[PDB]
Structure 1
Amino acid sequence: KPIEHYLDASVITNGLSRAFSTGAWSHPFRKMERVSGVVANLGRANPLQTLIDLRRTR
Protein backbone atom coordinates (compact mmCIF):
# COMPACT_ATOMS: atom_id res chain seq x y z
CA LYS A 1 0.00 0.00 0.00
CA PRO A 2 1.28 3.48 -0.88
CA ILE A 3 1.69 6.31 1.61
CA GLU A 4 -0.86 8.49 -0.23
CA HIS A 5 -3.84 6.31 0.78
CA TYR A 6 -4.20 6.58 4.58
CA LEU A 7 -3.41 10.31 4.93
CA ASP A 8 -6.74 12.07 4.33
CA ALA A 9 -5.97 15.31 2.49
CA SER A 10 -9.56 16.62 2.52
CA VAL A 11 -10.06 16.50 6.31
CA ILE A 12 -7.98 19.67 6.74
CA THR A 13 -9.57 21.56 3.82
CA ASN A 14 -13.15 20.70 4.84
CA GLY A 15 -12.35 21.80 8.40
CA LEU A 16 -10.72 25.08 7.37
CA SER A 17 -13.55 25.93 4.95
CA ARG A 18 -16.13 25.20 7.67
CA ALA A 19 -14.23 27.31 10.22
CA PHE A 20 -13.97 30.17 7.73
CA SER A 21 -17.64 29.94 6.74
CA THR A 22 -19.34 29.38 10.11
CA GLY A 23 -16.89 31.56 12.04
CA ALA A 24 -16.53 29.00 14.85
CA TRP A 25 -12.81 29.07 15.68
CA SER A 26 -11.06 26.73 18.10
CA HIS A 27 -10.88 27.68 21.77
CA PRO A 28 -7.33 28.41 23.03
CA PHE A 29 -7.84 26.64 26.39
CA ARG A 30 -10.43 24.02 25.40
CA LYS A 31 -11.39 21.54 22.69
CA MET A 32 -15.17 21.97 22.35
CA GLU A 33 -17.23 25.21 22.78
CA ARG A 34 -15.94 27.00 19.70
CA VAL A 35 -15.93 30.79 20.05
CA SER A 36 -17.64 33.09 17.55
CA GLY A 37 -16.39 36.50 16.48
CA VAL A 38 -12.96 35.77 15.01
CA VAL A 39 -13.63 36.15 11.28
CA ALA A 40 -15.99 38.68 9.71
CA ASN A 41 -17.22 39.91 6.35
CA LEU A 42 -15.88 43.02 4.65
CA GLY A 43 -18.00 46.06 3.86
CA ARG A 44 -17.83 47.35 0.29
CA ALA A 45 -19.79 50.60 0.55
CA ASN A 46 -16.67 52.81 0.77
CA PRO A 47 -12.90 52.18 1.11
CA LEU A 48 -12.92 53.53 4.69
CA GLN A 49 -15.09 50.66 5.99
CA THR A 50 -12.77 47.98 4.60
CA LEU A 51 -9.81 49.97 5.96
CA ILE A 52 -11.23 50.05 9.50
CA ASP A 53 -12.32 46.41 9.17
CA LEU A 54 -8.65 45.43 8.73
CA ARG A 55 -7.83 47.58 11.79
CA ARG A 56 -9.88 45.97 14.56
CA THR A 57 -8.93 44.26 17.83
CA ARG A 58 -11.51 42.30 19.83
Structure 2
Amino acid sequence: LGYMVKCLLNSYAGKRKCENRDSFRNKRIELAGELLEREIRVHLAHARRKMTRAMQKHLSGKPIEHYLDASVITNGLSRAFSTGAWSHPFRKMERVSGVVANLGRANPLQTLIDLRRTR
Protein backbone atom coordinates (compact mmCIF):
# COMPACT_ATOMS: atom_id res chain seq x y z
CA LEU A 1 0.00 0.00 0.00
CA GLY A 2 2.93 2.37 0.61
CA TYR A 3 4.24 1.58 -2.87
CA MET A 4 0.69 2.08 -4.22
CA VAL A 5 0.57 5.58 -2.68
CA LYS A 6 4.12 6.31 -3.88
CA CYS A 7 3.14 5.29 -7.44
CA LEU A 8 0.14 7.67 -7.22
CA LEU A 9 2.35 10.54 -6.06
CA ASN A 10 4.90 9.80 -8.81
CA SER A 11 2.09 9.99 -11.39
CA TYR A 12 0.60 13.17 -9.90
CA ALA A 13 4.05 14.79 -9.93
CA GLY A 14 4.41 14.03 -13.66
CA LYS A 15 7.21 11.45 -13.57
CA ARG A 16 5.34 8.18 -14.15
CA LYS A 17 3.00 8.33 -17.13
CA CYS A 18 -0.58 7.13 -16.85
CA GLU A 19 -1.44 3.72 -18.31
CA ASN A 20 -3.55 4.04 -21.46
CA ARG A 21 -6.11 1.55 -22.76
CA ASP A 22 -4.87 1.90 -26.36
CA SER A 23 -1.99 -0.59 -26.03
CA PHE A 24 -1.44 -4.35 -25.84
CA ARG A 25 0.74 -4.31 -22.73
CA ASN A 26 -2.37 -3.60 -20.64
CA LYS A 27 -4.90 -5.55 -22.76
CA ARG A 28 -5.47 -9.31 -22.92
CA ILE A 29 -7.90 -11.41 -24.96
CA GLU A 30 -9.95 -14.55 -24.31
CA LEU A 31 -10.68 -17.25 -26.92
CA ALA A 32 -13.16 -19.85 -25.57
CA GLY A 33 -11.04 -20.60 -22.49
CA GLU A 34 -11.89 -17.53 -20.42
CA LEU A 35 -15.00 -16.56 -22.41
CA LEU A 36 -16.91 -19.85 -22.41
CA GLU A 37 -16.37 -20.29 -18.65
CA ARG A 38 -18.43 -17.18 -17.79
CA GLU A 39 -21.59 -18.64 -19.34
CA ILE A 40 -21.07 -21.78 -17.23
CA ARG A 41 -20.36 -19.77 -14.06
CA VAL A 42 -23.57 -17.76 -14.60
CA HIS A 43 -25.80 -20.75 -15.42
CA LEU A 44 -24.54 -22.96 -12.57
CA ALA A 45 -25.80 -20.27 -10.19
CA HIS A 46 -29.15 -20.41 -12.02
CA ALA A 47 -29.18 -24.19 -11.56
CA ARG A 48 -28.30 -23.87 -7.85
CA ARG A 49 -31.05 -21.26 -7.41
CA LYS A 50 -33.56 -23.78 -8.78
CA MET A 51 -32.20 -26.79 -6.86
CA THR A 52 -32.42 -24.92 -3.53
CA ARG A 53 -35.95 -23.72 -4.37
CA ALA A 54 -36.94 -27.31 -5.23
CA MET A 55 -35.38 -28.72 -2.03
CA GLN A 56 -36.99 -26.03 0.15
CA LYS A 57 -40.51 -27.18 -0.81
CA HIS A 58 -39.97 -30.96 -0.74
CA LEU A 59 -38.57 -30.94 2.82
CA SER A 60 -40.72 -28.48 4.81
CA GLY A 61 -43.67 -29.93 6.69
CA LYS A 62 -35.43 -40.13 -3.78
CA PRO A 63 -35.66 -38.39 -7.18
CA ILE A 64 -32.08 -37.14 -7.39
CA GLU A 65 -32.31 -36.84 -11.19
CA HIS A 66 -35.46 -34.70 -10.87
CA TYR A 67 -34.01 -32.33 -8.25
CA LEU A 68 -31.00 -31.67 -10.54
CA ASP A 69 -32.62 -30.41 -13.74
CA ALA A 70 -30.22 -30.68 -16.69
CA SER A 71 -32.48 -28.61 -18.98
CA VAL A 72 -30.98 -25.27 -17.92
CA ILE A 73 -27.43 -25.27 -19.37
CA THR A 74 -28.47 -27.13 -22.54
CA ASN A 75 -31.23 -24.56 -23.14
CA GLY A 76 -29.00 -21.68 -22.03
CA LEU A 77 -25.88 -22.25 -24.12
CA SER A 78 -27.88 -22.87 -27.31
CA ARG A 79 -29.93 -19.73 -26.59
CA ALA A 80 -26.70 -17.75 -26.12
CA PHE A 81 -25.21 -19.18 -29.34
CA SER A 82 -28.35 -18.57 -31.42
CA THR A 83 -29.09 -14.91 -30.70
CA GLY A 84 -25.44 -14.09 -29.95
CA ALA A 85 -26.08 -12.77 -26.44
CA TRP A 86 -23.39 -13.22 -23.78
CA SER A 87 -22.47 -11.97 -20.30
CA HIS A 88 -20.60 -8.80 -19.43
CA PRO A 89 -16.98 -9.31 -18.27
CA PHE A 90 -17.15 -6.60 -15.58
CA ARG A 91 -20.87 -5.97 -15.04
CA LYS A 92 -23.53 -8.55 -14.15
CA MET A 93 -26.87 -7.37 -15.58
CA GLU A 94 -25.59 -6.63 -19.09
CA ARG A 95 -25.51 -8.53 -22.38
CA VAL A 96 -23.15 -8.08 -25.32
CA SER A 97 -23.86 -9.32 -28.86
CA GLY A 98 -20.43 -9.37 -30.49
CA VAL A 99 -18.97 -12.73 -29.47
CA VAL A 100 -20.64 -14.88 -32.14
CA ALA A 101 -20.28 -14.30 -35.89
CA ASN A 102 -21.68 -16.52 -38.63
CA LEU A 103 -19.02 -18.33 -40.65
CA GLY A 104 -18.99 -17.79 -44.41
CA ARG A 105 -18.06 -20.36 -47.05
CA ALA A 106 -17.85 -18.31 -50.25
CA ASN A 107 -14.09 -18.99 -50.49
CA PRO A 108 -11.56 -20.64 -48.14
CA LEU A 109 -9.80 -17.30 -47.57
CA GLN A 110 -12.82 -15.79 -45.78
CA THR A 111 -13.04 -18.68 -43.28
CA LEU A 112 -9.30 -18.27 -42.61
CA ILE A 113 -9.60 -14.61 -41.56
CA ASP A 114 -12.96 -15.08 -39.81
CA LEU A 115 -11.23 -17.34 -37.25
CA ARG A 116 -8.36 -14.91 -36.48
CA ARG A 117 -9.84 -11.57 -35.39
CA THR A 118 -9.93 -9.35 -32.30
CA ARG A 119 -12.87 -7.28 -31.05
Identical aligned pairs, as a percentage?
100
Instruction: Give RMSD over aligned pairs.
Output: 0.9
Distance 2:91 2:74 in 1: 22
Count of aligned pairs between the two proteins: 58
Structure having the larger proportion of residues in strand: 1
Q: Which range moved further: 7-16 or 28-37? A: 28-37
Divergent runs of 4+, >2 A: none
The offset of 1:3, in angstroms, is 1.5
Structure having the larger proportion of residues in helix: 2
| Higher-Rg member (1/2) | 2
Q: Which TM-score applies when normalising by structure 1?
A: 0.91
Q: Which runs of 5+ in 1 are unaligned?
A: none
The offset of 1:37, in angstroms, is 0.5
Q: Which runs of 5+ in 2 are unaligned?
A: 1-61
Higher relative contact order (CA 8 A, sep 6+): 1
Distance 1:44 1:56 in 2: 17
